[PDB]
Amino acid sequence: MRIINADGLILGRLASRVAKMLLEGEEVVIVNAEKAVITGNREVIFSKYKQRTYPKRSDEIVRRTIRGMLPWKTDRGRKAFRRLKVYVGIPKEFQDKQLETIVEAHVSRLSRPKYVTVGEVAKFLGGKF
């Protein structure tokens, strides 16, 4: 399996790359889901997700975003989605494992980064975490 640390990764980019991994047969675990980021204006992002509510918890938001990038309705999409596990923080079983990142998804690769974390969106919506 491949364990990805979502800390500082742009949600959309993270989701697109992970969807491809799942379709290619890889088992993917995402940790620190609440630390992934969404670029844009804070009020606009909050409003957008407020209208969608749809999961309100960080891990669920990340899971749903990835589901939308897969051929969900098909048999190939369902099988791929089954190989995904998402968690907030880093559960005990993954604390001493190698955590990978996705360089292309780093928000730090942006010149003028404006963003909020998934956790901040979850808190705003009333999610547990």
In terms of Cα–Cα distance, which of 59, 64, 11, 46 is closest to 125? 46
Structure tokens at 26: 């890889």
In the three-class reduction of DSSP (H, G, I as helix; E, B as strand; rest coil), residue 16 is classed as helix
Dist. CA 103–CA 115, nearest whole Å: 17
In the three-class reduction of DSSP (H, G, I as helix; E, B as strand; rest coil), residue 42 is classed as helix
Structure tokens at 101: 């990142």
Superfamily in which the 1-129 domain is placed by CATH: Ribosomal protein L13 (3.90.1180.10)
Q: Do strands 37-39 and 28-31 pair parallel, antiparallel, or not at all (unpaired)?
A: unpaired
Domain ranges of the chain: 1-129
- b/e per residue 54-91 (b: at least 16 CB within 10 A): ebbbbbbbbbebbbebbeeeeeebeebbeebbbbbebe
Residue pair 87/61 in contact (Cβ under 8 Å)? The answer is no
Dist. CA 67–CA 78, nearest whole Å: 9
Residue pair 18/84 in contact (Cβ under 8 Å)? The answer is yes
In terms of Cα–Cα distance, which of 101, 90, 82 is closest to 2? 101
Task: Give me the resolution in angstroms, 1 decimal.
Answer: 1.6
Distances (CA, A) of 3 to 46, 53, 72: 28, 29, 22
Signed CA dihedral, 126, 81, 102, 26: sign only: positive
